[PDB]
Design a protein around this ligand. Structure first.
Ligand SMILES: O=c1ccn([C@@H]2O[C@H](COP(=O)(O)O)[C@@H](O)[C@H]2O)c(=O)[nH]1
Ligand SMILES: O=c1ccn([C@@H]2O[C@H](COP(=O)(O)O)[C@@H](O)[C@H]2O)c(=O)[nH]1
Lengths: 258, 258
């Protein structure tokens, strides 16, 4: 295929409204940066969302790490998402049978479906995992990302595992909008590719995380969006760091567009 | 080779303390039944744990489906666990990079490590998932189960994936006490095998769950413990249903012991 812009893909025929909403704000704001807001305090989550909101297309959460979660916190996050124009991605990694994951998505204390635009799923259980999430997510106009590859050393999400992930996406394109992957895994331009394991300096952490640059992941490997946690969160000035990552990911996307 | 009793297995030189405690109470109470307590209310959770405690070796939770979770509820559950003698297994299925899963296990609202004897992890991220959990579990004297196979249709946890799970468990035996699997996957008697997707009658559900009988799973496939949810919970008489499952699983274990 030849390279389409985020704006062209927003306008496509088969595109999920969520993905379309995302691709438009990306074009509008010149950002393909997803902030991984891996903090344990609501006040910090909310201050990051507000400060960095203009710089990001998406805020990714791990609600189960928030020491002071309440649905009111999520209400305030929604208000910031609407105000600054970004989607909320809860990185819950649903990975159970369909009958269980539907309850874990709809219910409990988190009520994830009520506030998350996007969630993700591991494909290891078979397509039941997507079917269960769909029953809840479809009417709510939510979307789902399938984990086709992981960034960590020893990752088993390779080969036929990755190919099964892409098939599963194709079979459920009414609800699945794309992939968590280290590179482009599907040529279909309606699918989003989001890549974690990103820092300016290629490298890793002490527990198997691997990092590659925005230029590599977006430019060479053809992914759409970078997911960045520690590369931003650990900085003294998280706004400056966010801006650095945004320009890098954006300029890398412009480059491959030609 | 020659099958050892649960009582003898509990005394093996390399046995993990949590596995030893469980094997002891299984032999004492003549139960290799784990109740899957898939309910949405604390009261239902506590009611089932009390009513069925005598029949079970283990209660498996999904605390993220509890509408009214609080840590006090867990305190109470533990009192029941200590009174009736069963372990608590939170079926969280950790499946993220090591840096993330340690926070998910220790922290947030659920504080899983503060009350769960056992948790489980998917192996797809590589062994960094176990190394992260260990940082939290080992100080708290906890154990972990690796998901080597799944019960659901289209499961990708097969062949080399399954073998990678077994290797990973062998290499982290200070923390990993066994497997979620549909059959015996390790020949080392220090490892436990727990099998979900169990009902007396043939079948499945509308979202990819598949059922096999206790005699099939324990007797022919050589697993140790049956995990049963709806097979008990949906029955009119849960005390009778729990007893039927216990007696099925236990006699199947005795037969294989010869
Ligand atoms: O394959 C994956 C999938 C998800 N994440 C998530 O993306 C973020 C990476 O953060 P950092 O390593 O950039 O701090 C974390 O929240 C992590 O859970 C990965 O790192 N790799
Ligand atoms: O491979 C697996 C792993 C876990 N479970 C869990 O075991 C229970 C099965 O319940 P039921 O089908 O017996 O009601 C559920 O809590 C489900 O999440 C499975 O069914 N299959």
């Amino acid at each position: 295929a030849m390279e389409l812009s985020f704006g062209a893909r927003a306008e496509l025929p088969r595109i999920h409204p969520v993905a379309s909403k995302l691709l438009r704000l990306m074009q509008k704001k010149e950002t393909n940066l997803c902030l991984s807001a891996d903090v344990s305090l609501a006040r910090e989550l909310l201050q990051l969302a507000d400060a960095l909101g203009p710089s990001i297309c998406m805020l990714k959460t791990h609600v189960d790490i928030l020491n002071d979660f309440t649905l009111d916190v999520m209400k305030e996050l929604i208000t910031l998402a609407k105000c600054h124009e970004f989607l909320i991605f809860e990185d819950r990694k649903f990975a159970d049978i369909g009958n269980t994951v539907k309850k874990q998505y709809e219910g409990g204390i988190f009520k994830i479906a009520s506030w998350a635009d996007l969630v993700n799923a591991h494909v290891v259980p078979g397509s039941g995992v997507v079917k269960g999430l769909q029953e809840v997510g479809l009417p709510l106009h939510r979307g789902c990302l399938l984990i086709a590859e992981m960034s960590s050393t020893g990752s088993l999400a390779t080969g036929d595992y990755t190919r099964a992930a892409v098939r599963m996406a194709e079979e459920h394109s009414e609800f699945v909008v794309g992939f968590i992957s280290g590179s482009r895994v599907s040529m279909k331009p309606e699918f989003l590719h989001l890549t974690p394991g990103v820092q300016l300096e290629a490298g890793g952490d002490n527990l198997g995380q691997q990092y590659n640059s925005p230029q590599e992941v977006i430019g060479k490997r053809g992914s759409d969006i970078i997911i960045v946690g520690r590369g931003i969160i650990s900085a003294a000035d998280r706004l400056e760091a966010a801006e650095m990552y945004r320009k890098a990911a954006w300029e890398a996307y412009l480059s491959r567009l030609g």
